[PDB]
Design a protein around this nucleic acid. Structure first.
Ligand SMILES: [Mg+2]
Ligand SMILES: [Mg+2]
Ligand SMILES: [Mg+2]
Ligand SMILES: [Zn+2]
Ligand SMILES: [Zn+2]
Lengths: 112, 91, 77, 22, 135, 246
RNA sequence: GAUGGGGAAGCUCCGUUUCAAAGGCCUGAUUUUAUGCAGGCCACCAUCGAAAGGGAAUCCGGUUAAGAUUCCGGAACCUGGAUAUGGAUUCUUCACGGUAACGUAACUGAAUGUGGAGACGUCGGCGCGAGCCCUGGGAGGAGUUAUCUUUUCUUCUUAACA
RNA sequence: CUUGUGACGGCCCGUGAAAAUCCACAGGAAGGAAUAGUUUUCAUGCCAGGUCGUACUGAUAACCGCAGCAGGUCUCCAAGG
RNA sequence: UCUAAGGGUCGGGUACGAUCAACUUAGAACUGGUACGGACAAGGGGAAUCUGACUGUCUAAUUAAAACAUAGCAUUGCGAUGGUCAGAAAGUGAUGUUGACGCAAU
């Protein structure tokens, strides 16, 4: 039934002043300030969370290696897999559309 | 069971504000909170986000529409006469 | 603050030219209700980490004790 | 970082190539 | 009729080589024991050769005309077949089902697939196959 | 006497508009070269809600023709525009909803919105929700177009002015009763400090022309001359007629 | 709130990117050498404004008459800079594996562009976690005991970091 | 019970900050091996981290109300019946 | 002093049995100086009239109201070289990151 205190000079319950009660090896209860939780990185197109990317505060991404921040695909840590797939499909199909459009538009005015 | 005889969603307003005002508010909130057919994915998944913003939960499209309904009659007749003028401009 | 689980990697760690100090800890442990055995912890102080090797067998534990280098300052406790 | 980090990387490579120049 | 033949060129849409152009050398419509799906035994380009102009004299040309190939089993649902085609005779005998599960054989097959791709690229063949799909 | 409330409003101390949560000025794309010799295609990325505004906004992305980069313009969303729609802006643009054709190149009876007064001010007319401008006639020699405004007025503007084809989204808003002083509070809380309104007849005579008296009454006539001065213009300014017509 | 400007007899007022010739950035080249001349890149455009907003990184035990997340002992982490060794990669120069979602100790990438994080209302119910509360057995200590009570109270703990 | 969090649902003519800062992707400039290199986003190893505050009260006696004034003054923890 | 109902987890070739743990409700006897939400805690109600629709606000230190506000209704001005308002002036401002489903005045 021990009661705890803030360990810093902020006495207010702000977003950066979150505490958690822990039990020390001395057998007493003590507050422990916890940092704010990280949000998962989002896809650029669909806006959903990228799978396989570590979830850290933005300064902490400079400490981890490249494997924790990337996937082994084109647009790896940036776009979702289905978004990359559909833009590959879109790219190939409408360059083919442009080829067919170009040959038809040259052919009609070559005939006329 | 049918809990209210006639007030429906305006039953949250109690006896306040007058019955004829509550009638208009009921008629517009039913349109405001109903679901609509998505013109792209074909499902009954379009809902209002804010006034004029109608987003589909399935295919994640977002259409600009009327304040309380997804399409107003003024916009319908405007789209009809734009289509008619576009067919006339080649003829 | 790190667990090391390999004997040969522990031996090559003990001669890392920044290691000065090791400590050997004896504990009385009970794996089951009838068997009080002795556990040895070999704690090697590196420059940024403390590496602990846990040995549950006394013959292997003492064999590591003569296997320690002589320049390494050891603490028996 | 990435900017001061790339500057530190090129500084390390420049120093290394200057000493292996000799 | 069916079109997923042993000489077609496709674009991979999933995996490490997504967006890369491959040539099918060995179709398998009714799958196998280790692959219970309709698949193929494609070979493709991981690193495309770069653009070559008049300014580069022969050293940058030999540097920029390098091709890094790969060989891969892929599902048909992870392929996008195209209208073009590419002749296969030089390496259809050296890439096969037993040349996988063996890194030495994969290395040896990738060497000769690389040699074939460089000779076809230094000849004026298949500009669409050797171009990079930009997306 | 004191300085009255509408006289105090022009200093802009507490009467400035609350613009913290607004997403930018909703202007048309600038009329550079592409928009007056051909067209240009952009993309609708998202349709968003604007604080203090009844209409939604559209974030349209174009490519800069002179530099490798992307430009993001804020349009006022027309009713029917969806995300992922291609928007065409220019002289040669096809006549569809959302396109940014100039007014000289649309036929009779066209309904447009976000209309420039002069060519180049990037939208001035018919910008509130549900409003639109109708093209009433053309005049090729001395190149002007007549337009019908939302007020019913008929303007004669240049034929090089641009307008977005269709009506502004979010129409029919004012048909819903607010029902609550709290709803009016939250409505004006993001616009400006002009609410609640104390009647001037309920004041003291130091505070308003209408104030004072042993009964709440105006005193003189409430129709005020246009030549009146500041502190006098409280009432119906320059009224041609009053009363409810039948 | 300066500057460029424009008012004002003037103390000063307006304005904050404006009717301005508004600057600095990296590679280097040269090794009379200093840092100009080879280059190339970029156009925000002062500054002030939160000990409750955003934000790199520390915990436990002990210690004083009076200090401690600050001292002592132990155990960590971050930033800036130096740097060598091992590992990795390469004669197919700049890695392999998995159908795939993706995995690993690593596994060049300038200019320029794009995306993400920072970065976000309120209420309601439901799920999960931590601490506290309640409680059983057991190992210790204390209390009541005419009678009764295998009883009443108390100790049985585990930090950051990996 | 207090508190943190997750997936949701209701509400709005209210849809509920900005910047510093950090990371990734696209691109392929340039540099590159064979008797040798290239890499320090992998591991280990080396050095440094300046300035100012830091005691105590925070209220029927440490603040403001002429004062050791029943007044006023923001917030965290919260046992059993 | 009892009764009844409301569960979990394990068990079945190719209907049930075992174990464990909850406070919720309903009912029945019996009993007492008819007491029992036993202290604490805790609505007086009805029939009408005047007035303001309601929630809300104000005269800090004599007036909290029927006063003010309010949603609703209606009128007026204004298409930017503009309406209303500011400034001694200005290459000056507020509405205005605005445009008649808007702003301003009643
Ligand atoms: Mg990963
Ligand atoms: Mg106000
Ligand atoms: Mg009067
Ligand atoms: Zn995506
Ligand atoms: Zn849909």
């Amino acid at each position: 039934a021990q009661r705890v205190t803030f360990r810093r000079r902020n006495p207010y319950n702000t977003r950066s002043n979150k505490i958690k009660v822990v039990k020390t090896p001395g057998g007493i209860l003590r507050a422990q300030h916890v940092k704010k939780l990280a949000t998962r990185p989002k896809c650029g197109d669909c806006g959903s969370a990228l799978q396989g990317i570590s979830t850290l505060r933005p300064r902490q991404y400079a400490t981890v290696s490249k494997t924790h921040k990337t996937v082994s695909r084109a647009y790896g840590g940036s776009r979702c897999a289905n978004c990359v797939k559909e833009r590959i499909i879109r790219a190939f199909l409408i360059e083919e559309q442009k080829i067919v459009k170009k040959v038809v538009k040259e052919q009609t005015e070559a005939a006329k | 069971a049918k809990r209210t005889k006639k007030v429906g969603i305006t039953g949250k307003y109690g006896v306040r504000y007058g019955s004829s005002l509550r009638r208009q508010v009921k008629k517009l909130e039913i349109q405001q909170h109903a679901r609509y057919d998505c013109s792209f994915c074909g499902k009954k998944t379009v809902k209002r986000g804010a006034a004029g913003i109608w987003t589909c939960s399935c295919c994640k499209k977002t259409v600009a529409g009327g304040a309380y309904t997804v399409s107003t009659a003024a916009a319908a007749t405007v789209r009809s006469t734009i289509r008619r003028l576009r067919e006339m401009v080649e003829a | 603050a790190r667990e090391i689980t390999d004997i040969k990697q522990f031996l090559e760690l003990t001669r890392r030219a920044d290691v000065k100090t090791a400590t050997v800890k004896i504990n009385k442990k009970l794996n089951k209700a009838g068997k009080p055995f002795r556990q040895t912890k070999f704690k090697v102080r590196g420059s940024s980490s403390l590496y602990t090797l846990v040995i549950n067998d006394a013959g292997k534990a003492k064999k590591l004790i003569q296997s320690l280098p002589p320049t390494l300052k050891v603490n028996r406790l | 970082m990435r900017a001061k980090w790339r500057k530190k990387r090129t500084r390390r490579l420049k120093r290394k190539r200057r000493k292996v120049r000799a | 009729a069916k079109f997923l033949k042993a000489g077609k060129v496709a674009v991979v849409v999933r995996g490490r080589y997504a967006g890369k152009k491959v040539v099918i050398v060995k179709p398998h419509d009714e799958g196998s024991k280790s692959h219970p799906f309709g698949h193929a035994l494609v070979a493709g380009i991981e690193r495309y050769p770069l653009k070559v102009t008049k300014k580069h004299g022969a050293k940058k040309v030999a540097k920029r005309t390098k091709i890094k190939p790969f060989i891969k089993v892929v599902n048909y649902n992870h392929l996008l077949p195209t209208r073009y085609t590419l002749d296969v005779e030089a390496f259809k005998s050296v890439v096969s089902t037993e040349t996988f599960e063996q890194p030495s054989q994969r290395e040896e097959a990738k060497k000769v697939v690389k040699k074939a791709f460089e000779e076809r690229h230094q000849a004026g063949k298949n500009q669409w196959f050797f171009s990079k799909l930009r997306f | 006497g004191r300085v009255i409330r509408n006289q105090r409003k022009g200093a802009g101390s507490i009467f400035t508009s609350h613009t913290r949560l607004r997403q930018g000025a909703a202007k048309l794309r600038t009329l550079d070269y592409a928009e007056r010799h051909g067209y240009i295609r952009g993309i609708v990325k998202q349709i968003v809600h604007d604080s203090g505004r009844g209409a939604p906004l559209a974030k349209v992305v174009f490519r800069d023709p002179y530099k490798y980069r992307l430009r993001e313009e804020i349009f006022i969303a027309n009713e029917g525009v969806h995300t992922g729609q291609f928007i065409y802006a220019g002289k040669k643009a096809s006549l569809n909803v959302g396109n940014v054709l100039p007014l000289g190149s649309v036929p009779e009876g066209t309904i447009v919105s976000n209309v420039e007064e002069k060519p180049g001010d990037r939208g001035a007319l018919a910008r509130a929700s549900g409003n639109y401008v109708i093209i009433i006639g053309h005049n090729p020699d001395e190149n002007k177009t007549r337009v019908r405004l939302p007020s019913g007025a008929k303007k004669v503007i240049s034929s090089d002015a641009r307008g977005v084809i269709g009506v502004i989204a979010g129409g029919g808003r004012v048909d819903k009763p607010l029902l609550k002083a709290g709803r009016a509070f939250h409505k004006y809380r993001l616009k400006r400090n002009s609410w609640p309104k104390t009647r001037g007849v309920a004041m003291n005579p130091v505070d308003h022309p209408h104030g004072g008296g042993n009964h709440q009454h105006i005193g003189k006539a409430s129709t005020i001359s246009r030549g009146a001065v500041s502190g006098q213009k409280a009432g119906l300014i320059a009224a041609r007629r009053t009363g409810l017509l039948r």
